[PDB]
Amino acid sequence: AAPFTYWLNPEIYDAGGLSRRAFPEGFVFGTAASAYQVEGMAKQGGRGPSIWDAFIEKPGTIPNNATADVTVDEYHRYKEDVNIMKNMGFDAYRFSISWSRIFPNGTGMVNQEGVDYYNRLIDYMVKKGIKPYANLYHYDLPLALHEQYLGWLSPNIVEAFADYADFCFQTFGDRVKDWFTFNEPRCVAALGYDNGFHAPGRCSGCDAGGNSTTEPYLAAHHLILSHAAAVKRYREKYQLYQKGRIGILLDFVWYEPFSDSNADRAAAQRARDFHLGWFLDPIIHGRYPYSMLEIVKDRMPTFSDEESRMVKDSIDYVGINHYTSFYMKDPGPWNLTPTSYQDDWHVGFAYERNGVPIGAQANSYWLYIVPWGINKAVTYVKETYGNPTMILSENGMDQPGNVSITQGVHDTVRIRYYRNYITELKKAIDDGAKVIGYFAWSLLDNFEWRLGYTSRFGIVYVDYKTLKRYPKDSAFWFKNMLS
Template identity: 55%
Template sequence: MAKTRDMEAGRKLKSHHRIQRWADKSYKRCHLGNKWKKLFAGSSHGKKIVTFVPNDGCLNYIEENDEVLIVGFGRKGHAIGKPLRTRKLSKTGLNIRRISYTMLFKSGIANLVVSLLLVAFGIQTCSSQINRASFPKGFVFGTASSAFQYEGAVKADGRGPTVWDTFSHTFGKILDNSNADVAVDQYHRYPEDVQLMKDMGMDAYRFSIAWSRIFPNGTGQINQAGVDHYNKLIDALLAKGIEPYVTLYHWDLPQALDDKYKGWLDRQIINDFATYAETCFQKFGDRVKHWITFNEPHTFTIQGYDVGLQAPGRCSILLHLFCRAGNSATEPYIVAHNALLTHAKVADIYRKKYKAKQGGSLGIAFDVIWYESVSNSTEDAEATQRAQDFQLGWFLDPLMFGDYPSSMRNRVGSRLPRFTSSEAALLKGSLDFVGINHYTTFYAQRNATNLIGVVLNDSLADAGALTIPFKNGKPIADRANSIWLYIVPRGMRSLMNYIKQKYRNPTVIITENGMDDPNNRFTPIKEALKDDKRIKYHNDYLTNLLAAIKEDGCNVKGYFVWSLLDNWEWAAGYTSRFGLYFVDYKDNQKRYPKNSVQWFKNFLNSTK
């Protein structure tokens, strides 16, 4: 047998502890639905080997006594009868040859540390045949939506205007110059949509309440017609055995509050939102047991108050060339700070006055891109962490630890507001679950030139990190329709492990995951329903999520597909189709099931 080495990868690991630090426990083999085949081939040592036939993107390896020989990735695997060779790992640039089991585990049990390789080297769990029965008992599957993207009926039953009504009716703000006045008309067609969920076998539906349907002016008198509508929707869901997961704020700020005091820029919004939230607890809390205060606070902070690409469209980039008002260097931090304090106040109200009787839980849905360092350099690794600090950490650190990440404190300085001791105490521990909206993975690297800082002078520049989907001119993966959505299933597992390690394994719900196709008017509906790419997307992301749960011990309790229907996708308008159901916007928003609907039916109704 060749001499055992720690690792030959162009660079050596000096100690097995450097490997062990990534692993919480050992795992026997990559999950392949128990589809293993023994293959015998003549190695360079003339010994029998055991390997498996992989699917795309899976690790291939063999065992020789107490050693593991990494063969490579992908469908090719190791050809029977051919000499064993190492193969360059495209995601890391490393040539890994040998890892000793005894080096990894003093117990001598020959277990391959799959989670170790996943986190350390970006390895993705193989696709496999999975279904509902593969997941822990009680795991929740659902679909997700938002009021502004789905409801339409913008002037019905006393609804007040929102900042998105104003923004979408401003020429040039929406890619196809459309608006959501009709959207997919779920306000009137919710009984039909509830039945679609029931037919698929979904357990839950995540939707948002439009603040301006309950309080048309943001405050003041309650609009009973709005309350009645959501009562009917909730009752219709429960009648079909579908659990409502309710988001209180999915970006549709009442226009009256933006006019009155600039919305999230003023601390007055804390009390106004708390009044609205408590009204929802009073009116719906006897039946709603899962509340989400905010959807993607990072997105509405950056897009609305930093780069100005979404409502209310504030920024100061290039001397207000793109926005009429705003300060990109300060306003995002003020908005985020006020949103966090608002959540803390609402959580305190719910726990003190309603939780004991209603028995519900409360969280936030965070948007999270997973970042992989573009290289092994210390500078790029630190930049990758900063990118995550300025995204998830910006919001989750205060809610878990009582303050912003130290990297933000150091780099933003006096522009970053501070929490009082009482505010920090109220924030810390105010989540019952962590909602994660995850779609894609990017590379991150140090911003060496600071060109972004000169151009933007904003929170993106403050992070000192460039996040891009390319390395050496090659994309990180295949892309969906949206320019930001690259299909990288391994990012799901890596992100779950990151949250587990940094935030002490909180309860997590995947509150959004999905991909989009283009809305091509020349594509026949029959062809548009063939969404095999979406089927593979969900299968692969769910496979990696399952590995995070079962193999890595991540505490994930649910998965919500974005989205049930094609819908109005904010600044992209109707150019993007995320739905499991195709919506014909030219024929009264008629719904047609795509192939993914049948796939989910099979997935959710399989018991073995």
Template identity: 45%
Template sequence: MEDIDLIAKLGFGAYRFSISWSRIFPDGLGTKVNDEGITFYNNIINALLDRGIQPYVTLYHWDLPLHLHESMAGWLNKQIIEYFALYADACFASFGDRVKNWITINEPLQTAINGYDVAVFAPGRSENSQIEPYLAAHHQILAHAKAFSLYQRKYKDKQGGQVGLVVDCEWAEANSNKIEDKSAAARRLDFQIGWFLHPLYYGEYPEVMRERLGDQLPTFSEEDKKILFNALHFIGLNHYTSRFISHVRECTGENYYYKVQEMERIVEWEGGEAIGEKAASEWLYVVPWGLRKILNYVSQKYATPIFVTENGMDDEDNDNLPLHEMLDDKLRVRYFKGYLASVAQAIKDGADVRGYFAWSLLDNFEWAQGYTKRFGLVYVDYKNGLNRHPKSSAYWFSRFLKGGENEGKEE
């Protein structure tokens, strides 16, 4: 509750959080609702609304009930589509009178590739990386569509909410004007977001994926296509960074997903200068212009309202630095200024952007990186009672949201 007070105090009008499937159905099967879980989320939702903060709720952010993995191989089994629909139904029924913005699945790409190819996320599989990631993705797409269809049929008229899917994407900028590099950059975008959005608009995977993966890529039945068509009210876009892309025939040392794309991701301009300032995570460079480009790309290609559902950067956890230095996060302030300016430019370009969420409110558990990376606007003191300390970026956002200074022009 103190955190929700803090959200209100900083001036944010919306808060995006995830429901854990296991907290609603501990076995994942939808047989018996866990009332304590329902109460827990009711308390959060009501507290947000009491303070004038709109809840944006994600149903699945990579935490599959263990029983579903152990008993039926989780996302590799087509049955999971039905179980996900039962879970979504329970959430719509329990919370949909107050929650009007739903996200079915967060970053299905990461579940598929990091879970079933690179193996750094649960369930940590890499034994069959030519088949399993594409099967896991296929079932997530259909699970999303099934939940959307259920909402439309059963809840839309009564509750009046909207349902979207969150995809993640680095912007892919061709490394040169060569046709091979431009094709590689286009291919990269299709393998990131086309993979998940194309089926919802065209009933098929992108042509380049079908060509390169052949029989390894599952197909949609005619019945599937009916449920897939236009099965979303909005696109959620998680974006952090960008890369230059060049065509290569041989990708050395990469996992299968990258090899099949025949491209290299480059983090330097031609002269050797970094593409942007580097954050703590090895993959994260500060490249504000990439957000404008990806928003325009998605807007032009799919013509659906967009929410930027995650955007932010991390600092390294450092016990040796005094607290006041950890709190003075100048690079994060520069990051948000640059990226928000990019959002404003994309809106002027014609992109239908409806909202923006900073990642994240608090320093948190970053999956494979644990607590070593800090993305929060608010510092969490892990050694002293989890005390919260707003960073400079939190105060900057607070002024920005309250229309104080002309923040975008400062630097």
């Protein structure tokens, strides 16, 4: 790389008063990734196709028609990556298991080569002293199950998932003591079934078909039941003997009332219900949020008393993926003709107040830099859900894909992001929030779904021509902060 790559950024040594002592005893610091975004070997090693494999095939889906067939190729360079995490001082790694790498068809025949890969990765993490946190699902439904019965839209998916989870618990549970069923089921449901932005690409307008008024809610209901069923397998068959824990990863945008008026306040609350409460109300209270039931009515499925009891308290902790915040306005009189899940919120967004932007924007269209939002978000969870045990399970920001190694590694905006968000998180914790861990998204620049390689979330720069890794200033900022 050009000589400027190796300039020593003094920001690295500015920890803003953060250290392991500033956090609770045994607090875990990690990084997070997912199978599809980092593994490569998409069509190799016995892996069956997922809905993203099919979705990507349609031209124009991913910028420059890029694929995740190789991506950053962690399938082969997992040792190097784990070595980087260790060298940077991280305690843990949240990865995901590809359902279709284990069961090419989703059910039945186990792909042993796939199992051997996860076994290698986990064994090496353990050997290096990195704690494995395993997520079972991160957007990668086996295509076969979508072909058979439309995947998440069928109640058949529930036991298919439980069986898959069950297998993972018995295969990997002797060393994996921390499990998650789903990463961001809200996004699976909304992006997958409301606006068709993610695989399977369904919505009211969409080429693949769909109905934005009903399918997101059906998907979500089955994801909640699938989660509950997986957790039941774990609790009844494995947990007492393996002595691990299980939870779920929920994305949570902070919604701030645009003003102190009752309408704006109620607008902010309604967005929280539709975004987070959709999933966390069932899990903590056994029921869907009140606003949702009243607005969506018959377009939302109902739990039986038996399902409600299975879902309630079906976590040992909750992962909160948090990045950003928006202002929320009452939008005025509601039009009540069913349009979409997003429209069902009946809120207006705002990104500035008194000519002042809520924060600077990162590369991603949705990502505003608002450190105080993490404090509000976590405090909200503490106060609303009975102070649950929490993991701050994703946090980070992106640069554009079109930067060189030389400029890409000097990501001082990212140092600032982490310093400020972690600082705001520390305050929430200091004020009583039972946060037990924090995970940065992500170790490496990787395949960023619809944005492909036009977005760089890593604290480590990856040259996509050579797949060489170059730690950014933010990686060294962590190494210094954590030592």
